[PDB]
Design an enzyme around this catalytic site. Structure first.
Site, PDB file in Angstrom:
ATOM      1  N   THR D  34       0.806  -1.215   0.000  1.00  0.00           N
ATOM      2  CA  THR D  34       0.000   0.000   0.000  1.00  0.00           C
ATOM      3  C   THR D  34       0.842   1.269   0.000  1.00  0.00           C
ATOM      4  O   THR D  34       2.003   1.258   0.412  1.00  0.00           O
ATOM      5  CB  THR D  34      -0.926   0.043   1.229  1.00  0.00           C
ATOM      6  N   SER D  35       0.247   2.361  -0.466  1.00  0.00           N
ATOM      7  CA  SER D  35       0.936   3.643  -0.500  1.00  0.00           C
ATOM      8  C   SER D  35       1.115   4.118   0.939  1.00  0.00           C
ATOM      9  O   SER D  35       0.280   3.840   1.801  1.00  0.00           O
ATOM     10  CB  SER D  35       0.124   4.662  -1.306  1.00  0.00           C
ATOM     11  N   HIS D  93       8.248   0.704   3.660  1.00  0.00           N
ATOM     12  CA  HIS D  93       7.696  -0.454   4.343  1.00  0.00           C
ATOM     13  C   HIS D  93       8.942  -1.259   4.690  1.00  0.00           C
ATOM     14  O   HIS D  93      10.000  -1.056   4.092  1.00  0.00           O
ATOM     15  CB  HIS D  93       6.807  -1.280   3.405  1.00  0.00           C
ATOM     16  N   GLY D  94       8.832  -2.165   5.650  1.00  0.00           N
ATOM     17  CA  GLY D  94       9.986  -2.963   5.998  1.00  0.00           C
ATOM     18  C   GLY D  94       9.665  -4.053   6.991  1.00  0.00           C
ATOM     19  O   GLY D  94       8.537  -4.170   7.457  1.00  0.00           O
ATOM     20  N   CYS D 135       8.688  -0.942   9.562  1.00  0.00           N
ATOM     21  CA  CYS D 135       8.337  -1.995  10.510  1.00  0.00           C
ATOM     22  C   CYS D 135       9.532  -2.907  10.723  1.00  0.00           C
ATOM     23  O   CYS D 135      10.430  -2.978   9.883  1.00  0.00           O
ATOM     24  CB  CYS D 135       7.160  -2.832   9.995  1.00  0.00           C
TER      25      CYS D 135
END
EC number: 3.4.22.56
Lengths: 146, 103, 103, 146
Positions: D34-35, D93-94, D135
Protein backbone atom coordinates in the site's frame (compact mmCIF):
# COMPACT_ATOMS: atom_id res chain seq x y z
CA UNK A 1 8.80 25.11 43.56
CA UNK A 2 10.96 26.10 40.62
CA UNK A 3 11.11 24.69 37.10
CA UNK A 4 11.22 20.87 37.01
CA UNK A 5 12.53 19.14 33.86
CA UNK A 6 12.55 15.37 34.52
CA UNK A 7 15.21 14.59 31.90
CA UNK A 8 16.95 11.97 34.06
CA UNK A 9 15.71 8.85 35.82
CA UNK A 10 15.06 9.18 39.55
CA UNK A 11 18.04 7.31 41.01
CA UNK A 12 17.70 8.35 44.64
CA UNK A 13 15.33 5.62 45.80
CA UNK A 14 16.43 3.89 49.04
CA UNK A 15 18.08 1.16 46.95
CA UNK A 16 19.87 1.38 43.61
CA UNK A 17 18.42 -2.03 42.85
CA UNK A 18 19.50 -5.57 42.03
CA UNK A 19 22.39 -6.61 39.81
CA UNK A 20 21.84 -10.23 38.85
CA UNK A 21 24.91 -11.89 37.36
CA UNK A 22 24.49 -15.22 35.58
CA UNK A 23 27.95 -16.69 35.11
CA UNK A 24 27.97 -19.82 32.95
CA UNK A 25 31.45 -21.31 32.73
CA UNK A 26 30.88 -25.08 32.58
CA UNK A 27 28.34 -26.70 30.27
CA UNK A 28 26.90 -30.20 30.21
CA UNK A 29 28.96 -32.61 28.11
CA UNK A 30 25.71 -33.47 26.34
CA UNK A 31 25.63 -30.00 24.73
CA UNK A 32 29.16 -30.17 23.35
CA UNK A 33 29.79 -26.59 24.47
CA UNK A 34 33.28 -25.71 25.69
CA UNK A 35 34.10 -24.20 29.08
CA UNK A 36 34.39 -20.41 29.10
CA UNK A 37 37.80 -19.84 30.66
CA UNK A 38 38.22 -16.38 32.12
CA UNK A 39 34.53 -15.80 32.79
CA UNK A 40 35.11 -15.95 36.55
CA UNK A 41 37.37 -12.92 36.18
CA UNK A 42 34.47 -11.11 34.48
CA UNK A 43 32.00 -12.15 37.18
CA UNK A 44 34.28 -10.97 40.00
CA UNK A 45 35.04 -7.69 38.25
CA UNK A 46 31.32 -7.05 37.78
CA UNK A 47 30.54 -7.88 41.41
CA UNK A 48 33.12 -5.35 42.64
CA UNK A 49 32.19 -2.68 40.09
CA UNK A 50 28.46 -2.76 40.78
CA UNK A 51 29.06 -3.16 44.52
CA UNK A 52 30.74 0.26 44.47
CA UNK A 53 27.73 1.68 42.62
CA UNK A 54 25.65 0.45 45.57
CA UNK A 55 23.80 -2.33 43.76
CA UNK A 56 22.64 -5.48 45.53
CA UNK A 57 24.76 -7.95 43.57
CA UNK A 58 23.59 -11.57 43.37
CA UNK A 59 25.72 -14.08 41.48
CA UNK A 60 24.69 -17.46 40.07
CA UNK A 61 27.05 -19.93 38.41
CA UNK A 62 26.39 -22.60 35.78
CA UNK A 63 22.60 -22.40 35.52
CA UNK A 64 20.53 -24.67 33.30
CA UNK A 65 18.00 -23.12 30.94
CA UNK A 66 15.28 -24.02 33.46
CA UNK A 67 17.14 -22.36 36.34
CA UNK A 68 17.76 -19.22 34.32
CA UNK A 69 14.05 -18.81 33.61
CA UNK A 70 13.12 -19.63 37.22
CA UNK A 71 15.65 -17.11 38.51
CA UNK A 72 14.40 -14.33 36.23
CA UNK A 73 10.77 -15.12 37.01
CA UNK A 74 11.39 -15.08 40.77
CA UNK A 75 13.38 -11.84 40.65
CA UNK A 76 10.73 -10.15 38.49
CA UNK A 77 8.11 -11.05 41.09
CA UNK A 78 9.97 -9.35 43.92
CA UNK A 79 8.78 -5.95 45.15
CA UNK A 80 11.11 -3.43 43.49
CA UNK A 81 9.18 -0.42 44.84
CA UNK A 82 12.14 0.98 46.79
CA UNK A 83 14.69 0.21 44.06
CA UNK A 84 15.79 2.77 41.45
CA UNK A 85 16.63 0.30 38.70
CA UNK A 86 17.37 -3.27 37.69
CA UNK A 87 20.52 -4.77 36.21
CA UNK A 88 21.11 -8.23 34.78
CA UNK A 89 24.41 -9.44 33.36
CA UNK A 90 24.51 -12.57 31.21
CA UNK A 91 27.87 -14.29 30.67
CA UNK A 92 27.66 -17.35 28.44
CA UNK A 93 27.77 -18.83 24.95
CA UNK A 94 25.10 -17.44 22.67
CA UNK A 95 23.80 -16.60 19.22
CA UNK A 96 21.60 -13.82 17.91
CA UNK A 97 18.75 -13.43 20.39
CA UNK A 98 19.84 -16.43 22.45
CA UNK A 99 21.78 -17.06 25.65
CA UNK A 100 22.85 -20.57 26.62
CA UNK A 101 22.00 -22.28 29.86
CA UNK A 102 24.29 -25.18 30.78
CA UNK A 103 21.92 -27.65 29.09
CA UNK A 104 20.41 -25.62 26.28
CA UNK A 105 19.38 -22.20 24.89
CA UNK A 106 17.10 -19.57 26.39
CA UNK A 107 15.49 -16.88 24.24
CA UNK A 108 16.56 -13.46 25.47
CA UNK A 109 13.00 -12.30 24.87
CA UNK A 110 11.72 -14.87 27.38
CA UNK A 111 14.09 -13.45 30.00
CA UNK A 112 13.33 -9.77 29.36
CA UNK A 113 9.56 -10.25 29.05
CA UNK A 114 9.34 -10.87 32.80
CA UNK A 115 10.38 -7.25 33.25
CA UNK A 116 8.00 -5.66 30.74
CA UNK A 117 6.29 -2.48 31.93
CA UNK A 118 3.02 -4.37 32.32
CA UNK A 119 4.43 -7.52 33.94
CA UNK A 120 6.71 -6.02 36.61
CA UNK A 121 4.81 -2.98 37.87
CA UNK A 122 7.33 -2.07 40.58
CA UNK A 123 9.86 -1.47 37.79
CA UNK A 124 7.52 0.40 35.43
CA UNK A 125 9.15 3.70 34.47
CA UNK A 126 12.51 2.56 35.86
CA UNK A 127 15.60 1.63 33.80
CA UNK A 128 16.03 -2.09 33.19
CA UNK A 129 19.56 -2.86 32.03
CA UNK A 130 20.68 -6.08 30.37
CA UNK A 131 24.42 -6.50 29.83
CA UNK A 132 25.21 -9.37 27.49
CA UNK A 133 28.56 -11.06 26.87
CA UNK A 134 27.87 -13.69 24.21
CA UNK A 135 28.14 -14.30 20.46
CA UNK A 136 25.47 -12.92 18.15
CA UNK A 137 26.55 -14.83 15.07
CA UNK A 138 29.57 -16.18 13.18
CA UNK A 139 30.81 -13.08 11.39
CA UNK A 140 34.37 -11.89 11.93
CA UNK A 141 35.54 -8.28 11.72
CA UNK A 142 38.88 -8.02 9.92
CA UNK A 143 39.12 -4.36 10.88
CA UNK A 144 40.77 -1.52 8.98
CA UNK A 145 44.09 0.21 9.62
CA UNK A 146 43.68 3.76 10.91
CA UNK B 1 -3.28 21.07 15.75
CA UNK B 2 -5.25 17.94 16.62
CA UNK B 3 -5.22 14.28 15.64
CA UNK B 4 -6.36 10.74 16.40
CA UNK B 5 -3.09 9.48 17.89
CA UNK B 6 -1.86 12.04 20.41
CA UNK B 7 -2.68 13.54 23.81
CA UNK B 8 -4.59 10.56 25.24
CA UNK B 9 -6.66 11.16 28.38
CA UNK B 10 -5.21 8.05 30.01
CA UNK B 11 -1.42 8.18 29.92
CA UNK B 12 0.38 4.98 28.95
CA UNK B 13 3.91 4.00 28.01
CA UNK B 14 5.12 1.13 25.80
CA UNK B 15 5.67 -2.13 27.68
CA UNK B 16 9.03 -2.29 25.89
CA UNK B 17 10.07 1.16 27.10
CA UNK B 18 12.89 1.80 29.58
CA UNK B 19 15.06 -1.15 28.56
CA UNK B 20 18.73 -0.88 27.62
CA UNK B 21 20.72 -3.75 26.17
CA UNK B 22 24.49 -3.41 26.30
CA UNK B 23 25.69 -6.02 23.80
CA UNK B 24 29.36 -6.99 23.69
CA UNK B 25 29.41 -7.18 19.90
CA UNK B 26 27.64 -6.10 16.72
CA UNK B 27 24.62 -8.06 15.42
CA UNK B 28 25.73 -11.25 13.68
CA UNK B 29 29.30 -11.21 15.00
CA UNK B 30 31.38 -13.36 17.34
CA UNK B 31 32.28 -11.92 20.74
CA UNK B 32 35.83 -12.26 22.07
CA UNK B 33 37.07 -13.44 25.45
CA UNK B 34 40.63 -13.73 26.75
CA UNK B 35 40.94 -17.09 28.51
CA UNK B 36 42.94 -15.35 31.24
CA UNK B 37 41.80 -11.73 31.60
CA UNK B 38 38.12 -12.17 30.74
CA UNK B 39 36.01 -10.81 27.88
CA UNK B 40 37.12 -7.61 26.16
CA UNK B 41 33.66 -6.13 26.69
CA UNK B 42 33.26 -6.83 30.41
CA UNK B 43 36.90 -5.87 31.08
CA UNK B 44 36.26 -2.53 29.38
CA UNK B 45 32.80 -1.96 30.83
CA UNK B 46 34.05 -2.36 34.40
CA UNK B 47 37.03 -0.09 33.74
CA UNK B 48 34.85 2.69 32.31
CA UNK B 49 32.24 2.38 35.07
CA UNK B 50 34.98 2.51 37.70
CA UNK B 51 36.42 5.66 36.11
CA UNK B 52 33.30 7.50 34.95
CA UNK B 53 30.21 6.30 36.85
CA UNK B 54 30.35 9.36 39.12
CA UNK B 55 31.00 11.75 36.23
CA UNK B 56 29.17 10.77 33.02
CA UNK B 57 25.68 9.82 31.85
CA UNK B 58 25.37 6.08 31.08
CA UNK B 59 25.20 6.31 27.28
CA UNK B 60 28.41 8.34 27.32
CA UNK B 61 30.06 5.75 29.55
CA UNK B 62 29.03 2.99 27.15
CA UNK B 63 30.37 5.03 24.24
CA UNK B 64 33.77 5.08 25.97
CA UNK B 65 33.46 1.29 26.32
CA UNK B 66 32.77 1.10 22.58
CA UNK B 67 35.94 3.06 21.83
CA UNK B 68 38.10 1.08 24.26
CA UNK B 69 37.10 -2.30 22.83
CA UNK B 70 37.29 -1.10 19.22
CA UNK B 71 40.75 0.45 19.50
CA UNK B 72 42.66 -1.54 22.11
CA UNK B 73 41.75 -5.15 21.33
CA UNK B 74 42.61 -7.50 18.47
CA UNK B 75 42.38 -11.29 18.58
CA UNK B 76 45.31 -13.69 18.59
CA UNK B 77 44.84 -17.23 17.31
CA UNK B 78 46.97 -20.04 15.94
CA UNK B 79 44.07 -20.51 13.52
CA UNK B 80 44.45 -17.88 10.79
CA UNK B 81 40.66 -17.78 10.44
CA UNK B 82 40.21 -16.37 13.94
CA UNK B 83 43.41 -14.32 14.11
CA UNK B 84 43.72 -10.52 14.06
CA UNK B 85 39.99 -9.90 14.41
CA UNK B 86 38.25 -6.84 15.83
CA UNK B 87 35.13 -6.12 17.87
CA UNK B 88 32.70 -3.23 18.37
CA UNK B 89 30.15 -3.37 21.23
CA UNK B 90 26.53 -2.51 20.45
CA UNK B 91 24.42 -0.18 22.61
CA UNK B 92 20.69 -0.74 22.16
CA UNK B 93 18.64 1.85 24.01
CA UNK B 94 14.89 2.01 24.52
CA UNK B 95 15.45 4.29 27.51
CA UNK B 96 13.33 7.43 27.84
CA UNK B 97 15.58 9.47 30.13
CA UNK B 98 19.23 10.11 30.89
CA UNK B 99 20.74 7.77 33.47
CA UNK B 100 23.28 8.78 36.10
CA UNK B 101 24.38 6.32 38.77
CA UNK B 102 24.93 9.22 41.15
CA UNK B 103 22.54 11.92 42.38
CA UNK C 1 50.23 -6.51 32.53
CA UNK C 2 50.63 -8.01 29.06
CA UNK C 3 48.60 -10.22 26.75
CA UNK C 4 48.09 -11.58 23.25
CA UNK C 5 45.14 -9.36 22.29
CA UNK C 6 46.00 -5.77 23.22
CA UNK C 7 48.30 -2.90 22.27
CA UNK C 8 48.87 -3.88 18.62
CA UNK C 9 51.72 -2.16 16.78
CA UNK C 10 49.47 -1.43 13.81
CA UNK C 11 46.33 0.35 14.97
CA UNK C 12 43.04 -0.83 13.49
CA UNK C 13 39.36 -0.28 14.18
CA UNK C 14 36.40 -2.59 13.50
CA UNK C 15 34.89 -2.15 10.03
CA UNK C 16 31.52 -2.02 11.81
CA UNK C 17 32.60 0.80 14.11
CA UNK C 18 31.21 4.34 13.97
CA UNK C 19 27.71 3.39 12.81
CA UNK C 20 24.51 4.50 14.52
CA UNK C 21 21.09 3.17 13.62
CA UNK C 22 18.12 5.19 14.81
CA UNK C 23 15.21 2.76 14.49
CA UNK C 24 11.65 4.03 14.76
CA UNK C 25 10.50 1.01 16.75
CA UNK C 26 11.66 -1.90 18.91
CA UNK C 27 12.91 -5.13 17.29
CA UNK C 28 9.99 -7.25 16.06
CA UNK C 29 7.37 -4.49 16.30
CA UNK C 30 5.23 -2.54 13.86
CA UNK C 31 6.07 1.14 13.32
CA UNK C 32 3.28 3.73 13.26
CA UNK C 33 2.58 6.50 10.77
CA UNK C 34 -0.19 9.10 10.76
CA UNK C 35 -1.59 9.28 7.23
CA UNK C 36 -1.71 13.07 7.59
CA UNK C 37 1.07 14.25 9.93
CA UNK C 38 3.72 11.66 9.09
CA UNK C 39 5.37 8.95 11.19
CA UNK C 40 5.50 9.40 14.95
CA UNK C 41 9.24 8.77 14.90
CA UNK C 42 10.24 11.21 12.17
CA UNK C 43 7.82 13.85 13.51
CA UNK C 44 9.49 13.55 16.91
CA UNK C 45 13.05 13.27 15.63
CA UNK C 46 12.76 16.51 13.65
CA UNK C 47 11.16 18.31 16.59
CA UNK C 48 13.93 17.26 18.99
CA UNK C 49 16.71 18.06 16.50
CA UNK C 50 15.17 21.48 15.87
CA UNK C 51 15.04 22.17 19.61
CA UNK C 52 18.22 20.52 20.88
CA UNK C 53 20.75 20.06 18.04
CA UNK C 54 22.69 23.13 19.21
CA UNK C 55 22.51 22.12 22.88
CA UNK C 56 22.72 18.35 23.42
CA UNK C 57 24.88 15.39 22.40
CA UNK C 58 23.16 13.15 19.81
CA UNK C 59 22.41 10.17 22.08
CA UNK C 60 20.69 12.53 24.50
CA UNK C 61 18.66 14.04 21.66
CA UNK C 62 17.58 10.56 20.56
CA UNK C 63 16.66 9.73 24.16
CA UNK C 64 14.28 12.72 24.13
CA UNK C 65 12.84 11.35 20.88
CA UNK C 66 12.33 8.01 22.64
CA UNK C 67 10.40 9.70 25.44
CA UNK C 68 8.30 11.85 23.10
CA UNK C 69 7.15 8.90 20.99
CA UNK C 70 6.60 6.64 24.00
CA UNK C 71 4.51 9.11 25.98
CA UNK C 72 2.66 11.28 23.47
CA UNK C 73 1.50 8.80 20.83
CA UNK C 74 -1.10 6.02 20.81
CA UNK C 75 -2.68 4.49 17.72
CA UNK C 76 -6.27 4.93 16.62
CA UNK C 77 -7.90 2.29 14.43
CA UNK C 78 -11.39 1.11 13.55
CA UNK C 79 -9.82 -2.36 13.76
CA UNK C 80 -9.62 -3.27 17.46
CA UNK C 81 -6.49 -5.30 16.73
CA UNK C 82 -4.51 -2.21 15.76
CA UNK C 83 -6.17 0.26 18.12
CA UNK C 84 -4.64 1.88 21.21
CA UNK C 85 -1.12 0.63 20.50
CA UNK C 86 2.17 2.14 21.65
CA UNK C 87 5.67 2.55 20.24
CA UNK C 88 9.21 2.94 21.58
CA UNK C 89 12.05 3.92 19.19
CA UNK C 90 15.29 1.93 19.33
CA UNK C 91 18.73 3.55 19.39
CA UNK C 92 21.48 1.21 18.21
CA UNK C 93 24.92 2.72 18.66
CA UNK C 94 28.28 1.40 17.51
CA UNK C 95 29.69 4.93 17.77
CA UNK C 96 33.05 5.43 19.48
CA UNK C 97 32.73 9.11 20.39
CA UNK C 98 30.18 11.69 21.45
CA UNK C 99 28.49 13.49 18.57
CA UNK C 100 27.54 17.17 18.57
CA UNK C 101 26.16 18.80 15.43
CA UNK C 102 27.71 22.09 16.52
CA UNK C 103 31.32 22.99 17.31
CA UNK D 1 49.43 22.66 23.34
CA UNK D 2 47.30 21.77 26.35
CA UNK D 3 45.57 18.52 27.24
CA UNK D 4 43.64 16.98 24.33
CA UNK D 5 40.88 14.44 25.08
CA UNK D 6 39.24 13.46 21.76
CA UNK D 7 35.95 12.36 23.33
CA UNK D 8 33.82 13.83 20.53
CA UNK D 9 33.85 13.38 16.76
CA UNK D 10 35.54 16.13 14.76
CA UNK D 11 32.54 17.94 13.27
CA UNK D 12 34.29 21.05 11.96
CA UNK D 13 35.29 19.74 8.54
CA UNK D 14 34.41 22.12 5.66
CA UNK D 15 31.17 20.17 5.12
CA UNK D 16 28.88 18.49 7.65
CA UNK D 17 28.28 15.84 5.01
CA UNK D 18 25.48 14.31 2.98
CA UNK D 19 21.97 13.52 4.18
CA UNK D 20 20.45 11.06 1.73
CA UNK D 21 16.69 10.68 2.08
CA UNK D 22 14.99 7.76 0.35
CA UNK D 23 11.26 8.45 0.38
CA UNK D 24 9.19 5.52 -0.86
CA UNK D 25 5.50 6.40 -0.98
CA UNK D 26 4.15 4.51 -4.00
CA UNK D 27 4.89 0.85 -4.66
CA UNK D 28 4.43 -1.28 -7.75
CA UNK D 29 1.00 -2.91 -7.92
CA UNK D 30 2.84 -6.19 -8.46
CA UNK D 31 4.13 -6.11 -4.87
CA UNK D 32 0.72 -5.58 -3.29
CA UNK D 33 2.18 -2.97 -0.94
CA UNK D 34 0.00 0.00 0.00
CA UNK D 35 0.94 3.64 -0.50
CA UNK D 36 2.49 5.31 2.54
CA UNK D 37 0.31 8.38 3.03
CA UNK D 38 2.00 11.11 5.04
CA UNK D 39 5.55 10.11 4.13
CA UNK D 40 5.99 13.28 2.07
CA UNK D 41 5.43 15.27 5.25
CA UNK D 42 8.27 13.28 6.85
CA UNK D 43 10.57 13.81 3.87
CA UNK D 44 9.97 17.57 3.81
CA UNK D 45 10.43 17.88 7.58
CA UNK D 46 13.73 15.99 7.35
CA UNK D 47 14.95 18.14 4.46
CA UNK D 48 14.32 21.33 6.44
CA UNK D 49 15.69 19.96 9.71
CA UNK D 50 18.96 18.70 8.27
CA UNK D 51 19.27 21.76 6.02
CA UNK D 52 19.47 23.88 9.17
CA UNK D 53 22.17 21.56 10.53
CA UNK D 54 24.11 22.40 7.36
CA UNK D 55 23.87 18.99 5.70
CA UNK D 56 23.82 18.57 1.92
CA UNK D 57 20.34 17.06 1.65
CA UNK D 58 19.55 14.91 -1.38
CA UNK D 59 16.07 13.43 -1.73
CA UNK D 60 14.95 10.49 -3.87
CA UNK D 61 11.36 9.32 -4.25
CA UNK D 62 9.95 5.88 -5.04
CA UNK D 63 13.15 3.96 -5.76
CA UNK D 64 13.22 0.33 -6.85
CA UNK D 65 15.45 -2.11 -4.97
CA UNK D 66 17.97 -1.78 -7.82
CA UNK D 67 17.97 2.02 -7.64
CA UNK D 68 18.40 1.98 -3.87
CA UNK D 69 21.52 -0.17 -4.14
CA UNK D 70 22.87 1.89 -7.06
CA UNK D 71 22.29 5.11 -5.12
CA UNK D 72 24.05 3.84 -2.01
CA UNK D 73 26.93 2.41 -4.03
CA UNK D 74 27.43 5.67 -5.93
CA UNK D 75 27.26 7.81 -2.79
CA UNK D 76 29.71 5.54 -0.96
CA UNK D 77 32.17 5.97 -3.83
CA UNK D 78 32.18 9.76 -3.58
CA UNK D 79 35.12 11.51 -1.92
CA UNK D 80 33.91 12.32 1.61
CA UNK D 81 37.33 13.66 2.69
CA UNK D 82 36.03 17.16 3.50
CA UNK D 83 32.79 15.92 5.10
CA UNK D 84 32.40 15.41 8.86
CA UNK D 85 29.79 12.67 8.68
CA UNK D 86 27.20 10.81 6.65
CA UNK D 87 23.45 10.54 7.14
CA UNK D 88 20.93 8.32 5.38
CA UNK D 89 17.21 8.29 6.11
CA UNK D 90 15.06 5.40 4.88
CA UNK D 91 11.29 5.89 4.73
CA UNK D 92 9.42 2.81 3.52
CA UNK D 93 7.70 -0.45 4.34
CA UNK D 94 9.99 -2.96 6.00
CA UNK D 95 10.55 -5.95 8.25
CA UNK D 96 13.37 -6.91 10.58
CA UNK D 97 16.61 -6.16 8.73
CA UNK D 98 14.82 -5.23 5.52
CA UNK D 99 13.75 -2.04 3.74
CA UNK D 100 11.44 -2.18 0.73
CA UNK D 101 12.20 -0.72 -2.65
CA UNK D 102 9.15 -0.07 -4.83
CA UNK D 103 9.51 -3.51 -6.45
CA UNK D 104 11.00 -5.62 -3.69
CA UNK D 105 13.12 -5.84 -0.50
CA UNK D 106 16.68 -4.69 0.12
CA UNK D 107 18.73 -6.07 3.00
CA UNK D 108 19.78 -3.23 5.29
CA UNK D 109 23.17 -4.93 5.57
CA UNK D 110 23.68 -4.59 1.81
CA UNK D 111 23.07 -0.85 2.09
CA UNK D 112 25.28 -0.24 5.14
CA UNK D 113 28.13 -2.46 3.93
CA UNK D 114 29.02 0.12 1.28
CA UNK D 115 29.98 2.41 4.15
CA UNK D 116 32.08 -0.05 6.17
CA UNK D 117 35.33 1.34 7.54
CA UNK D 118 37.28 -0.66 4.97
CA UNK D 119 35.03 0.02 1.97
CA UNK D 120 34.55 3.80 2.25
CA UNK D 121 37.92 5.10 3.43
CA UNK D 122 36.96 8.78 3.30
CA UNK D 123 34.38 8.04 6.01
CA UNK D 124 36.60 5.82 8.17
CA UNK D 125 36.55 7.15 11.72
CA UNK D 126 33.55 9.38 10.95
CA UNK D 127 29.98 8.87 12.20
CA UNK D 128 27.68 7.11 9.74
CA UNK D 129 24.04 7.57 10.72
CA UNK D 130 21.14 5.52 9.43
CA UNK D 131 17.65 6.70 10.40
CA UNK D 132 15.00 4.09 9.66
CA UNK D 133 11.23 4.52 9.58
CA UNK D 134 9.85 1.05 8.82
CA UNK D 135 8.34 -1.99 10.51
CA UNK D 136 10.62 -4.53 12.18
CA UNK D 137 7.98 -7.19 12.69
CA UNK D 138 4.31 -7.78 13.49
CA UNK D 139 4.26 -7.36 17.26
CA UNK D 140 1.99 -4.77 18.84
CA UNK D 141 2.66 -2.94 22.10
CA UNK D 142 -0.50 -2.67 24.20
CA UNK D 143 1.29 -0.34 26.60
CA UNK D 144 0.75 0.09 30.33
CA UNK D 145 -1.04 2.86 32.21
CA UNK D 146 1.34 5.10 34.17
Amino acid sequence: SGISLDNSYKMDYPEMGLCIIINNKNFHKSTGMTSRSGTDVDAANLRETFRNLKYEVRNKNDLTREEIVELMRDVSKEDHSKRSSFVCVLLSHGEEGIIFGTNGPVDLKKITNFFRGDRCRSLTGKPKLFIIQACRGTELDCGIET
Amino acid sequence: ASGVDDDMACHKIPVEADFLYAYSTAPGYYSWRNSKDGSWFIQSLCAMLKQYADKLEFMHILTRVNRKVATEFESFSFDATFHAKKQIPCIVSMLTKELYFYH
